[PDB]
Amino acid sequence: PMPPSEFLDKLMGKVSGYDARIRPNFKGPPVNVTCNIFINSFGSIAETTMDYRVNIFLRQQWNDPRLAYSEYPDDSLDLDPSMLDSIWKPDLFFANEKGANFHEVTTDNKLLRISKNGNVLYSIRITLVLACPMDLKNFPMDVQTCIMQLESFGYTMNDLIFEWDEKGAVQVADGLTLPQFILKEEKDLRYCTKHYNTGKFTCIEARFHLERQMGYYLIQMYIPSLLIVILSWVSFWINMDAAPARVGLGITTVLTMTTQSSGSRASLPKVSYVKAIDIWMAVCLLFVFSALLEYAAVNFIARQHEEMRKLFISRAKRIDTVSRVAFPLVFLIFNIFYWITYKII
Amino acid sequence: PMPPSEFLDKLMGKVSGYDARIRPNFKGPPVNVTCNIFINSFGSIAETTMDYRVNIFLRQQWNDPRLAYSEYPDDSLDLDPSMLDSIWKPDLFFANEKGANFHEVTTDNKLLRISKNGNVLYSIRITLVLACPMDLKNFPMDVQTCIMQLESFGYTMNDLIFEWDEKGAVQVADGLTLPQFILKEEKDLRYCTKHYNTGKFTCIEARFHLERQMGYYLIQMYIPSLLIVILSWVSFWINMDAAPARVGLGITTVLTMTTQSSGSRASLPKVSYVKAIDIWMAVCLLFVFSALLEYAAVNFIARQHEEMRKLFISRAKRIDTVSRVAFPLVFLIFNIFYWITYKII
Amino acid sequence: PMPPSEFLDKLMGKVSGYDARIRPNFKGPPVNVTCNIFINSFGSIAETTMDYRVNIFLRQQWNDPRLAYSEYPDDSLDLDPSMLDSIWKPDLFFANEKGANFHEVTTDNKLLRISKNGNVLYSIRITLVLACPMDLKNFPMDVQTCIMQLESFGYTMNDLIFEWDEKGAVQVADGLTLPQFILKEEKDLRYCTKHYNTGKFTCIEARFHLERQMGYYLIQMYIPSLLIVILSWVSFWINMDAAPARVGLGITTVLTMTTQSSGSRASLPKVSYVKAIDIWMAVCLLFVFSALLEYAAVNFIARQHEEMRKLFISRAKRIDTVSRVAFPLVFLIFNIFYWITYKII
Amino acid sequence: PMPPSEFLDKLMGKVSGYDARIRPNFKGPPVNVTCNIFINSFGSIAETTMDYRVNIFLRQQWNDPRLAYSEYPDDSLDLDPSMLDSIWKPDLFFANEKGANFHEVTTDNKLLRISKNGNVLYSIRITLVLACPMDLKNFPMDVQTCIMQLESFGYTMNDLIFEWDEKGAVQVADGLTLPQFILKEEKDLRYCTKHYNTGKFTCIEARFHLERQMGYYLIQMYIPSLLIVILSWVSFWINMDAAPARVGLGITTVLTMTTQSSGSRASLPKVSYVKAIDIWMAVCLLFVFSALLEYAAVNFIARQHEEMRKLFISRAKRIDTVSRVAFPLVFLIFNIFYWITYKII
Amino acid sequence: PMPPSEFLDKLMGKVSGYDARIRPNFKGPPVNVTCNIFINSFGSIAETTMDYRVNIFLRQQWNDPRLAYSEYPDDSLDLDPSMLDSIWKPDLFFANEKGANFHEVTTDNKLLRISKNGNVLYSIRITLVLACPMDLKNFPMDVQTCIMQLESFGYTMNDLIFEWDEKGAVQVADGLTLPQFILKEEKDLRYCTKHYNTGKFTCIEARFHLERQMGYYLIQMYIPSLLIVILSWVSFWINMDAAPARVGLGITTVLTMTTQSSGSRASLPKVSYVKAIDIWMAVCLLFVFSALLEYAAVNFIARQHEEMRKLFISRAKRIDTVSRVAFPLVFLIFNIFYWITYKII
Numbered sequence A, B, C, D, E: 001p002m003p004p005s006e007f008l009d010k011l012m013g014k015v016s017g018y019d020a021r022i023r024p025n026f027k028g029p030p031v032n033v034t035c036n037i038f039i040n041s042f043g044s045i046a047e048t049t050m051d052y053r054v055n056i057f058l059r060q061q062w063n064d065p066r067l068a069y070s071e072y073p074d075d076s077l078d079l080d081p082s083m084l085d086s087i088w089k090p091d092l093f094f095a096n097e098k099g100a101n102f103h104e105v106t107t108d109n110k111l112l113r114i115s116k117n118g119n120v121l122y123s124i125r126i127t128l129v130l131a132c133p134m135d136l137k138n139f140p141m142d143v144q145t146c147i148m149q150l151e152s153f154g155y156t157m158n159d160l161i162f163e164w165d166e167k168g169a170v171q172v173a174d175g176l177t178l179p180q181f182i183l184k185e186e187k188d189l190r191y192c193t194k195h196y197n198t199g200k201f202t203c204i205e206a207r208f209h210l211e212r213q214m215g216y217y218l219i220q221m222y223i224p225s226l227l228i229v230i231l232s233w234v235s236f237w238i239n240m241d242a243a244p245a246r247v248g249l250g251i252t253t254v255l256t257m258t259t260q261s262s263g264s265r266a267s268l269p270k271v272s273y274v275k276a277i278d279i280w281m282a283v284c285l286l287f288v289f290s291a292l293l294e295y296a297a298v299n300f301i302a303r304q305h306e307e308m309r310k311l312f313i314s315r316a317k318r319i320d321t322v323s324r325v326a327f328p329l330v331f332l333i334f335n336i337f338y339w340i341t342y343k344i345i
């Protein structure tokens, strides 16, 4: 008979009145576009720009009764992407694009299949730079939720309706990792139905749960800031009269706590509000700070100076055995009131 | 009757004389374009480039009496964005673009509605890289103001006038945060009316107030630089004759003040004039610097050396009890003359 | 006779029925496209974005019987790249593009040669920003495998089949280096044959083995962190009663281990899970940490204090000669259980 | 009468012989294009790429006698930017573009006004990434001069001549700052008249004088490196026999000078030749270096050891009072021969 | 007579048979294209991407006998860049582009001049991002060679031949600097004549010799690492029994050598193989490392302990005078075997 590329020019040409600027079922029921995506790549979750990029296969299915045919024998036709301007396509856009583009390598990466009863499959390949606001109040112990919503732009709710299909709405490719986060296998699928002063515009969204890994911040930032506080408690076991040994220990410890803190503020993000890791590196500074000011109290009582001269040594050794036990206990109370309050949020 | 996409080709074609290069109300009163924006995204406020990017919905409403109609029954038509070149559009441009682009994902994100009496709604989606000069003289305690102005380019004041509409001129999306600043809910709306040697060009602007958050700079930079100055005053309570303990304290303290200062100059911005945080890390260096030079004065008087040999110890202990009280008081006077002068600006 | 540029317009014009939207051997056997690439450049293997860019010569060969000819005398014609839209080209795309583009400098860098029997050579020049997920669990001792796969987009398995040619499928240019990795001369060539709900789409892939060089991390990060652990064992040979010498050595060594660790966390990548180098800089911190706590045990036993007063010195010298030998031996056990477990993975 | 958009199509159509590829006054006197710019934005003066970006209004005025008219009543017409290809425009380009682009937001930002006698105004909006070589031999004390030149490309000197207009050739917008430099209000305006083997091509240039601000480098780099040199002179006033106090002072001072130096080499630019700030941080290292080697000379003479045993103490106290005065004087001679030689260049 | 823009449409129109897809001298001798470039800008030589960008004037001269004319009186015509698609242009491409683009600011920066006998001058303006592999084995003392080669793409050796002209093939603009390198005035010009399985393709290349400047690395990295090794030899002149002074000197010196090393690894490039500067900062670490282990040998022999008790002091002072001279001599032998081996390569 006649080839499919010439059959579609007969179906959508100047004859048959198919105007590509008019939706199907015009002045009637709204077009029911069903959508499902397929994530190929997912990463570079920035926290200064607060965005993340994704590389999807956006599939769209709707019904168009003007494209139904019965003369041609085979079931599923296909339109070349160069002739794609002669099809009513839904004006889908992402409500938080923040920049995006298509792919045009060796062929426009666009697919169109017109079925026999009028069903139309439309699959394209988009690289998105989608934006999600991130809340870094508890920085190592956080669970991020970055949304992905698909509004309509020009058609209102009574003309065009988006829906996720009932069989695998959001898939993820198998071999896909992240440098910091992990992607949970729990995709929430819900409506949003945006309102304006213009009208009710449809939208569907898919939420992704991003859990941050921990093992770098414990090994490099919590454990070295733990051992420096333990070294600051060695001063309680060294003799009281060894005066160059005590202040040489108490201040080289607050120097290696400052070096550990300042050396790791470049690896941390640059938000301007107090994190979880920022509290830990400011309270572990206090336990090294409060372990010299006891020696400012120990060496001053012993220097006051008959049994009255022996009483001041008897009080300086009293405060050297209280704080020998109190500082490994007050730091343990903080070590409980820090992890419990961040495993509960 | 006839479809809307064929009704606009009759209205704006070679018939009816609608020339798209000629403004409405030609050789008469000026066109009154009323505008309102809708910010979707707002962030990446750079301070080296001195710019910020915004993602807006630019809505424009004017009146074009050549587009009025009464034969077609429905009230609001719509033109497809492929046929948008047959409409007089206002030549709005941002006076501080510094680069911008449209969005063309799955459809040109452009909307046009011609009402029955001739009112025209025109809504597009722009990603701007707008520029605002920033004044970082008092860096943690600053209130930035970044403008957003909308000039005309080719039409003068007697041909085209921009105005903000009287009902919600600038909206902001709800779930929108910033890494460093916060966005106040107070938008100043005013005219600017730019002049040149060419003529009076209209412009309307919208100012955004950006208050900088504080909690990172106190916990990581002010409080750790505070505790180092407190540790430098421990030298006044340690004994005078403990010579390896005093200079081992006074210089490991100026080393941990240099380590705290140099480790945080990478997180700070890179402007070349003195900030608020740069005065603090240069005066807190002086109090550690002036706490060794007293011991250079203490140890030198005691080394001068009968009651004349006991007078020099009596003067060295005098200056070790004056500066034991004076340095926590002179530093308190600076700590009042620093925050009061930056909560008043 | 007639020129070749006018002979191809007769062969592919409105006459002869050559429709460029229809594959050869239509409704018959599938088109056998044979492919081979030629890497010109290869580098910038990022580990935050997890991608790498490559600059290839993509050559494609297929058979198109509608382009066969016998009237023109010469064997191989050539079509100009401006007239390239009148050829059925395969819709090859890379399944992990993550952005790509052509090259259009002084001429479209595209080549087409139609042979006499219908064989078609098609060579283009593409810059890819291909993505490979990287596994930095053992960071200096790792072997990366970054794939490069070539799917079809619109044609299924029974219409278009990709194959590597049997003579040099993947070549690499000669003078081509890398900043960190080395590129092995072993290219795995295999099929993948992706399935969807749409159909069987063909794909061929080529794997590249990337081995990381070592010489920077040994000279700058392993050997300097080795010598600091050796300096921390000098404390066992210095006298027991030299109390400012022991704690002055044990804590300036944990300060130069913190300075070596924090100064090198900027050169390392910023993944959030524990590496191989991150274990080494956390266990070598413990051996400097555990060499002061022995002196907290030595100086405390000697301070307890007749032959009972001489027994406590006899036990403090016992633990000062056990750990004089034990710490160079326990660190040797870790130095065997660290390299063996990373030369075996 | 007739509208202006239809009057210019009569004036420049297929009738009247106006060919847009032929300059006015053909085979006669050269076209005198007078130019003036208007800088909107100016910043991001990079010193690794050695470029700076500017956002200008480029106005061009020439005479075109083929566009003169007398039938239409009004004085100044205007051509829409879509119809701008039917005008002879001068082929102005910037000789050091290094990348540039136009602006096309909501309308092409282009302006054209044909006057009655034939004078043509042409104003566009360009974002340039202009390049200027920078000479960082004396880095904080430098005055940069970055040119901006406007050549012709295809027409020689006897066909097209560029000139700055005699009334405000280069303006700058009012509220315009820079992060590091300041922009002087003194614009040099001169010709360059480039020669090649092709011919004499015209060019005009405008020079901008950029003076670098100072207040950050004094407060953060010169004054903290000054106070460390003063602390290194405290060793001359401490007693000679206090041997752990002297070398503990002289080497913790060369450590805080190294920490001040290495902590600030990330904020400095990364050129590979010696700056002004690089001499200051290498000579102030010597004054701390030369304050320990005197103590290596003090402690060695006193250790040589009857009145001959008292002569070695009598010489060690001689060199401890010479260098008590000499080092605050030799450093003052350097402090004069450093600022005078950099305020004179 | 007739204008030049209408004479070229007569010469290259549908009349006269000039087909722009066919080279001159078809089925005859190959076209001899002679080329010469003119570098406007040259910089941003990256070593992570291993590329450099250049901004050139590419001039091409060939002969086309179909464009010869004798009726028009003047010698040199010119074609407007809008009508440039009706000219056979050579398909020159750079073999290592790695991305490039043209310049289209106020006019397409393209020049074409057709002489009377058929000689065709063609000058364009290209911004290249050319790639050169760099060998950083001896990093401060290196001489880089970055090539620039110009292949043909579609025409083989028997159809199109590139040559450099015999009079100034590569010029460089006068006022042109670099941040790190210097550009030598010695350009090698040679052929390469690439082979494939496709055929012999012509290519000509130009080599640029880049020499790295030295003065920053001596002043900031070699001299401060030199003076720290000199300070580590002060320990040999201080008294043997001053035990807190020796280990306080030997380990604050290995701390300021680690601070000098770790603070400068951010300014160095990030290749993963050992450099020249990386050997220097790892051998100068050993001379500070081996200056404490001698004191571990000095203090241990003196602690062994009648004239047998005086023999151990007599051996400890022997090794304190051998290594007083040996370490300034062994370090001098390394200082000769380090510069001589890097001035010879």
Ligand SMILES: *[C@@H]1O[C@H](CO)[C@@H](O[C@@H]2O[C@H](CO)[C@@H](O[C@@H]3O[C@H](CO)[C@@H](O)[C@H](O)[C@@H]3O)[C@H](O)[C@H]2NC(C)=O)[C@H](O)[C@H]1NC(C)=O
Pocket (backbone or CB within 6 Å): A025, A029, A030, A031, A032, A063
């Ligand atoms: C696309 O989806 C819309 C909404 O999901 C469909 O519109 C709905 O059509 C059904 C039947 O065609 C109607 O709902 C029910 O109809 C019965 C019979 O008239 C009536 O008794 C019920 O009270 C109810 O209205 C209704 O017209 C309409 N809306 C809703 C909310 O159900 C539409 O059919 C779908 N397909 C197309 C091609 O548009």
Ligand SMILES: *[C@@H]1O[C@H](CO)[C@@H](O[C@@H]2O[C@H](CO)[C@@H](O[C@@H]3O[C@H](CO)[C@@H](O)[C@H](O)[C@@H]3O)[C@H](O)[C@H]2NC(C)=O)[C@H](O)[C@H]1NC(C)=O
Pocket (backbone or CB within 6 Å): B025, B029, B030, B031, B032, B063
């Ligand atoms: C667009 O806005 C402009 C300015 O806002 C309008 O022009 C103004 O039109 C009004 C009446 O149409 C005039 O103002 C007053 O008119 C009365 C009656 O003639 C006169 O007695 C007053 O002295 C005053 O002029 C005036 O012509 C004009 N300008 C101002 C400043 O009021 C215009 O009508 C608006 N609409 C359109 C479609 O252009």
Ligand SMILES: *[C@@H]1O[C@H](CO)[C@@H](O[C@@H]2O[C@H](CO)[C@@H](O[C@@H]3O[C@H](CO)[C@@H](O)[C@H](O)[C@@H]3O)[C@H](O)[C@H]2NC(C)=O)[C@H](O)[C@H]1NC(C)=O
Pocket (backbone or CB within 6 Å): C025, C029, C030, C031, C032, C063
């Ligand atoms: C392109 O490649 C395909 C598959 O590689 C080729 O299709 C294969 O064609 C061969 C012979 O033309 C057939 O295989 C065998 O054919 C014999 C003879 O009929 C039969 O007895 C065997 O049982 C077997 O089917 C077969 O039709 C087909 N598929 C396979 C799997 O062999 C094709 O010929 C190639 N060329 C073109 C121009 O498409």
Ligand SMILES: *[C@@H]1O[C@H](CO)[C@@H](O[C@@H]2O[C@H](CO)[C@@H](O[C@@H]3O[C@H](CO)[C@@H](O)[C@H](O)[C@@H]3O)[C@H](O)[C@H]2NC(C)=O)[C@H](O)[C@H]1NC(C)=O
Pocket (backbone or CB within 6 Å): D025, D029, D030, D031, D032, D063
């Ligand atoms: C554009 O500018 C050029 C140069 O600035 C103008 O060309 C100059 O025209 C003037 C008079 O039209 C001539 O200069 C003098 O002319 C008198 C009278 O013939 C003669 O006695 C003098 O010796 C001198 O040549 C001259 O032809 C020409 N060049 C110079 C250097 O003055 C031109 O008129 C301007 N306008 C246009 C529309 O091209």
Ligand SMILES: *[C@@H]1O[C@H](CO)[C@@H](O[C@@H]2O[C@H](CO)[C@@H](O[C@@H]3O[C@H](CO)[C@@H](O)[C@H](O)[C@@H]3O)[C@H](O)[C@H]2NC(C)=O)[C@H](O)[C@H]1NC(C)=O
Pocket (backbone or CB within 6 Å): E025, E029, E030, E031, E032, E063
């Ligand atoms: C472009 O360049 C090519 C090669 O440089 C030129 O081709 C050469 O043309 C010359 C003479 O036209 C020939 O070389 C010699 O010719 C003499 C006389 O026939 C013969 O006796 C010698 O043995 C030698 O072949 C030759 O045909 C050819 N190739 C070489 C290698 O010399 C060509 O003429 C240049 N011009 C054009 C417009 O193509």
